[PDB]
Design a protein around this nucleic acid. Structure first.
Ligand SMILES: *O[C@H]1[C@@H](O)[C@H](n2cnc3c(=O)[nH]c(N)nc32)O[C@@H]1COP(=O)(O)OP(=O)(O)OP(=O)(O)O
Lengths: 336, 922
RNA sequence: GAAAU
DNA sequence: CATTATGCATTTCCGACAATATCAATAC
DNA sequence: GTATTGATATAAGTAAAAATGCATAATG
């Protein structure tokens, strides 16, 4: 008993701020059937789910028509899209809230101030079965939002203090190639490093067959993505859109030191490790050469390393007696 | 030996001049040893320090620091020797194709011959000193930037080679300089070892070991990698306490012997150092035009003005210096001295599970604390260095050689200590020569004190009355400058106010003020010099009357008038009665009105005006929460007031801007023969150029920057070659032409005044607009300023400027689109068809320009018969040259001749009327 | 941060 | 040509200001 | 055959794309 907008309604929306949305109910139901969120969430009737940047909201409408959670809220500040959502979804079990998801204060006010959306805190033993977050960051200029969300996954502050919360993220295919980069690939970046350190991700859907060449073939064949054409998104001129599933994992290291080590090591991702240690600090080359016994590790480049060797190097940096003060690693070009 | 005290004690003029001559002949050796370079001196000092430390066993002080420097040099020298030997061996190869082509061919052939010249020990010393001097620069907390590192070492080595040339390939490529600097810095990083202590968390005990002194790392600033060298904390703490003198002597200091007068574009200033007459940084056009003008010898008046500016002798004000020393030694932050800050303190780290907003706020707070601490230390170090220079030169006579920037304004050669510094530096300087006050000396000293306190708008009689009323506390402050009433700190310029109060007390104590001897400079500052120059250029009676150009009983103030206009506008807005109006009703500040009204006529934008008013509203804190929106409201109102008030300044500005645009969008006819390969839309290599009345040429250097990565050993630095001529910055040139013109006019007037004062026999010091002379000579100084201003502005400067543009840029072409339907275009299309018939394809503007240049050469060709044939040829520019209405034609792309807009009408206003305007310059 | 327009 | 973008008056001095590494096509 | 040239990503709250403070330059 929930209406679903169509492309006739969607063509009346002048501004999308660069965000691309899929409007095909066939693609949404295929994606949901592949995902099978029911096994993880035993009782959807008591499930609480929060959505960020709904935009069109057909995904939210189909999700409700399928599972019917107890509470489902949308966070918006875009004027035209918010007005359209309010007009279409008024007098419905769905709920729409006019708050900008970008602001950090938004979540703190929404949860810790006036009880509007209260999740349940769960231990890091298993994926939370009472909280779920869905976002849409297809905008090209909002990569920093996704990276800050990954850092928040690492720091257990923004919304992952409630436990291991599964995250669905509509997000650009170029960033998909960036994040889903196995060691040795030419697209390996610190984004991928933090992705594999903090989470384990699976790719679900992608709007372009050509983009699948970049990704790892074994990962593609194991995931079996639901490929779909480029005619299911109203803005055609935009770049291809992919989907990822974010599942936090347990980790035992110091986030600040690990971040510093990765950032200052894999700047020179093509150089061999026999010389990159000099960038870490003073005497780092000699210290790591003396400490490390595995000679193959030194021959391996930072683009060939993985989270295990990164944690090993972080531990070596920790028991380095003369490690530099990583707190003050910044430039003082600041307004005064 | 207090030379100033001895000179003042000498009672006879003959023996005074004899003592001055003896001091001058005595100080030659001291000046030479001060001006001498630092390489050999530092080498010998380090050698002696190492030998005495060897004799005494060891040390743990800056002596040990110099011993470590000697050890670094001794270990480095074999490496540089081996590198030079390798370069020499590789340069003797008869022929090879790929002999280490990755490394040897690309680099050793690049920087072999350049490195093989200079002494390896000299290069070692230079690179060590350069890297040690470069500390905490480039925005790096504990190190410095690689891009500056490689260039500074390369530039210093080239300058060292030039020093070897004068003892007997004029300029080195930027890539070669960067490569040499990177190579030497790499060798230094490989060698420099420093011991350091640490505690192993597993061991939980102190560890003794050695670590490299320098490290090459990368830092991220908003997503951009930075090349950073990091200096070890031991070296940081062992170099912090030596200031800028103990480690190595400075290079630019005030002299003691008479400065060498300006004769050529390079001959002047320091005796054993060459200083360019123009502050040309990376402007080949500027240096070329300056060389041509110097060869033509038409800047003798500029030479005379600079000689007069740099001939005046100075000395350090002993009393104010003692007061400043007492305040600094007391340790507490005074009005100007920041004070002693012990060390850094950082806020405690919030829990890692706290809110990301909280973490961001903590990070911002830490960054702010770090920036504030660094800025305060730097300020305290600079003040300490100024005090050190003042104490070193206390009691002696000082000379200040001057220099000019491309606009023509005058600047001292010594930047650390000068009369252009802050209030403390200005107060710590007095003239060496003392002159009797005469009848008007007391009056002028009183005027100087009163307008130092900020009462310069009020008439001279009221200023004298103010000083007479406050003489009691003047005497009080003079008797006890510290631990007393402290009346001088209530002034706008406390240190100069203190000095003037001392002089006034000395006058008051003496029975006869007529015969007193004074050394205090008296500042005679003009009011609204830019608006004055507009008034003189346009001949507008209203503007001249507003800017005190005409004689008057009371001095009118444009700033006060427009402030009252803003008062009226806001009291009209009181009907709306917004919060901004209610807050800003009785708090419109003459300082913000000053800045905005003054800078409106130079092409200021709305954003710039908002920033200026917000910045000047910050100290008084009318809107402590956020002043930006109210600043925008005020900018709107003041802009409305200025647009309704000013009407001829705007006309001159608009004409200059349109001329600048037309110049910046043109191209040379025959010079464009070079294959720029763009075909239809060429590049622009035309910069606005004109000559000052003094004869100094001016070249605006606004050009695009071609920054490219160049491969070096350390990294691929991102620098730009300054020798690559690039297309001009049209917007920059158009926005900067009027201010450059006005400041050039101001500098020309100042130089004429200085030359005439030197001829008349006065002591002249000029802080740009304001002029400084003795208290007795103020009347003759005012007379000579007025005479020189009449001489300068009695000619139609704007008309002569347009004539200069027309003479210089007669044979120029400006590309302008023309409507297809135009009947004249049909002839143009037919002509270009012939230009297409010979070419066989679409007509090219390059070929059209070449054809146009063919006709122009024939007009000046020696052959009269061919000149008639040359006049027979017709082109697109030739066809239009018969038509004067350029706007009539203004589709198809057609070449157009360069025609500058006609000057605005010259208003009728006699300039000589200022001979009796006592308030013109005050 | 300082100086001038 | 109506539509869309770019930078915001000038100059001097000071530790000011200010990217680099990796990988593709290509030009030779 | 290979070396020079151009493109792209890094980190990640100085958002970005709506607006607008605005004049002028660059778009298709
Ligand atoms: O107040 C200044 C000062 O503390 C410091 N600062 C910034 N630039 C300089 C400089 O060239 N020289 C000195 N001695 N101090 C400097 O920072 C404060 C201003 O910070 P901003 O980021 O606004 O600085 P910027 O250079 O961009 O502008 P300005 O305010 O100094 O003109």
């Amino acid at each position: 008993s929930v209406p679903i907008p169509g492309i006739k309604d969607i063509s009346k929306l002048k501004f999308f701020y660069g965000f691309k949305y899929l409007w095909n109910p066939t693609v949404y139901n295929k994606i949901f059937d592949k995902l099978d969120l029911t096994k993880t969430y035993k009782h959807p009737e008591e499930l609480k789910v929060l959505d960020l940047y709904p935009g069109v909201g057909i995904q939210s409408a189909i999700f409700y028509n399928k599972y019917c959670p107890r509470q489902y809220s949308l966070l918006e500040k875009r004027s035209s899209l918010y007005k359209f959502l309010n007009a279409k979804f008024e007098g419905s079990p769905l709920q729409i809230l006019k708050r900008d998801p970008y602001d950090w204060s938004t979540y703190s006010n929404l949860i810790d101030e006036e009880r509007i959306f209260v999740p349940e805190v769960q231990s890091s033993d298993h994926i939370n079965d009472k909280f779920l977050t869905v976002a849409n960051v297809t905008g090209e200029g909002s990569e920093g939002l996704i990276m800050q969300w990954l850092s928040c996954i690492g720091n257990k502050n923004w919304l992952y203090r409630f436990g291991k919360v599964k995250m669905l993220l509509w997000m650009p295919s170029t960033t998909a190639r960036k994040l889903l980069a196995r060691p040795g690939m030419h697209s390996r970046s610190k984004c991928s490093v933090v992705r594999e350190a903090f989470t384990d991700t699976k790719l679900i859907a992608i709007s372009d067959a050509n983009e699948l060449k970049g990704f790892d073939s074994q990962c593609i064949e194991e995931w079996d993505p639901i490929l779909f054409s480029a005619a299911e998104i109203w803005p055609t001129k935009g770049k291809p859109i992919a989907l990822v599933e974010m599942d936090p994992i347990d980790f035992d290291f110091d986030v600040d030191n690990w971040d510093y080590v990765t950032r200052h090591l894999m700047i020179l991702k093509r150089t061999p490790l026999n010389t990159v240690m000099d960038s870490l600090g003073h005497g780092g080359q000699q210290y790591f050469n003396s400490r490390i016994t595995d000679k193959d590790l030194l021959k391996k480049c930072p683009i060939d390393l993985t989270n295990d060797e990164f944690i090993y190097l972080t531990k070596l940096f920790m028991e380095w007696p003369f490690k530099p003060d990583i707190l003050m690693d910044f430039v003082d070009m600041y307004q005064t | 030996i207090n030379f100033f005290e001895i000179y003042n004690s000498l009672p006879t003029l003959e023996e005074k001049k004899a003592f001055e001559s003896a001091l001058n002949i005595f100080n030659q050796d001291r000046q030479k040893v001060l001006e001498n370079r630092a390489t050999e001196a530092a080498r010998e000092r380090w050698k002696h320090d190492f030998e005495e430390a060897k004799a005494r066993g060891d040390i743990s002080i800056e002596k040990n620091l110099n011993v470590k420097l000697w050890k670094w040099y001794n270990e480095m020298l074999p490496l540089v020797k081996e590198e030079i030997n390798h370069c020499r061996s590789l340069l003797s190869e008869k022929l090879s194709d790929k002999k280490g082509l990755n490394k040897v061919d690309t680099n050793r052939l690049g920087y072999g011959p350049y490195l093989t010249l200079i002494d390896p020990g000299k290069m070692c010393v230079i690179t060590i000193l350069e890297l040690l001097k470069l500390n905490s620069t480039g925005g790096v907390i504990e190190g410095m930037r690689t891009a500056r590192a490689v260039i500074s070492v390369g530039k210093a080595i080239e300058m060292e080679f030039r020093s070897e040339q004068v003892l007997k390939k004029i300029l080195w490529p930027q890539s070669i300089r960067a490569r040499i600097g990177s190579v030497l810095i790499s060798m230094l990083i490989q060698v420099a070892k420093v011991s350091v202590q640490g505690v192993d968390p597993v061991t939980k005990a102190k560890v003794h070991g050695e670590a490299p002194a320098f490290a090459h790392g990368y830092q991220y600033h908003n997503g951009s990698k930075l090349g950073v060298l990091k200096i070890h904390k031991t070296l940081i703490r062992q170099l912090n306490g030596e200031r800028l003198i103990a480690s190595v002597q400075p290079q630019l200091l005030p002299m003691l012997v008479e400065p060498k007068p300006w004769v050529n574009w390079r001959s002047g200033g320091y005796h054993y150092t060459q200083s360019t007459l123009l502050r040309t940084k990376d402007s080949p056009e500027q240096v070329a035009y300056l060389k041509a003008a110097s060869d033509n010898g038409d800047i003798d008046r500029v030479y005379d003005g600079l000689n007069v500016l740099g001939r005046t002798p100075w000395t350090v004000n002993r009393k104010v210096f003692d007061v400043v020393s007492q305040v600094w030694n007391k340790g507490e932050g005074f009005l100007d001295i920041p004070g002693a800050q012990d060390e850094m303190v950082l806020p405690p780290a919030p829990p890692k599970n706290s809110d990301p907003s909280i973490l961001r706020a903590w990070k911002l707070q830490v960054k702010t604390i770090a920036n504030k601490f660094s800025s305060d230390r730097s300020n305290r170090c600079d003040t300490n260095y100024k005090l050190e220079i003042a104490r070193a030169f206390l009691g002696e006579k000082l000379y200040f050689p001057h220099n000019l920037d491309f606009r023509g304004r005058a600047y001292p050669l010594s930047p650390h200590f000068n009369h252009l510094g802050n209030d403390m530096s200005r107060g710590l300087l007095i003239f060496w020569h003392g002159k009797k006050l005469g009848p008007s000396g007391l009056k002028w000293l009183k005027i100087h004190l009163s307008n130092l306190f900020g009462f310069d708008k009020l008439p001279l009689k009221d200023r004298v009355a103010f000083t007479e009323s406050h003489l009691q506390d003047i005497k009080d402050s003079a008797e006890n400058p510290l631990t007393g009433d402290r009346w001088w700190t209530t002034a706008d310029k406390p240190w100069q106010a203190l000095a003037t109060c001392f002089e006034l007390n000395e006058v008051m104590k003496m029975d006869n003020p007529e015969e007193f001897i004074s050394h205090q400079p008296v500042h005679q500052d003009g009011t609204c010099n830019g608006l004055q120059h507009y008034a003189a250029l346009g001949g507008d009676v209203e503007g001249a009357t507003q800017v005190n150009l005409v004689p008057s009983d009371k001095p009118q103030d444009v700033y006060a008038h427009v402030a009252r206009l803003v008062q009226k506008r806001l009291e009209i807005a009181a009907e709306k009665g917004d919060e901004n109006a209610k807050i800003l009703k009785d708090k419109i500040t003459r300082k913000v009105v000053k800045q905005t009204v003054m800078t409106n006529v130079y092409g200021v934008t709305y954003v710039g005006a908002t920033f200026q008013i917000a910045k000047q509203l910050s100290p008084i804190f009318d809107d402590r929460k956020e002043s930006l929106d109210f600043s925008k409201y005020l900018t709107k109102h003041v802009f409305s007031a200025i647009r309704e008030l000013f009407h001829s300044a705007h006309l001159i500005q608009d004409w200059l801007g349109e001329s600048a645009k037309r110049i910046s969008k043109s191209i040379r006819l025959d010079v464009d023969e070079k294959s720029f390969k763009n075909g239809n839309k060429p590049d622009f290599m035309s910069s606005v150029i004109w000559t000052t009345p003094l004869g100094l040429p001016i070249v605006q250097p606004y050009r695009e920057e071609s920054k490219k990565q160049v491969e070096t050993n350390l990294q691929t630095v991102f620098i730009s070659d300054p020798f690559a001529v690039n297309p001009v910055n049209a917007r920059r040139q158009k926005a900067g032409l009027p201010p450059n013109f006005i400041h050039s006019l101001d500098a020309s007037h100042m130089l004429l005044s200085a030359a005439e004062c030197g001829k008349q026999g006065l002591d002249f010091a000029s802080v740009h607009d304001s002029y400084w002379t003795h208290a007795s000579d103020i009347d003759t100084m005012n007379v000579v300023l007025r005479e020189q201003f009449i001489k300068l502005h009695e000619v139609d400067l704007v008309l002569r400027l347009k004539e200069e543009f027309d003479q210089r840029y007669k044979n120029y072409v400006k590309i302008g689109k023309l409507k297809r339907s135009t009947d004249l275009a049909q002839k143009i299309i037919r002509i270009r068809k012939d230009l297409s018939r010979k070419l066989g394809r679409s007509t090219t503007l390059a070929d059209e320009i070449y054809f146009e240049k063919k006709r122009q050469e024939l007009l000046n060709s020696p052959l009269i018969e061919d000149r008639n044939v040359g006049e027979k040829m017709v082109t697109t520019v030739s066809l239009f040259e018969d038509i004067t209405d350029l706007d009539a034609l203004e589709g198809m792309s057609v070449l157009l001749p360069l025609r500058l807009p006609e000057i605005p009408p010259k208003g009728d206003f006699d300039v000589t009327v200022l001979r009796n305007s006592q308030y013109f310059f005050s």
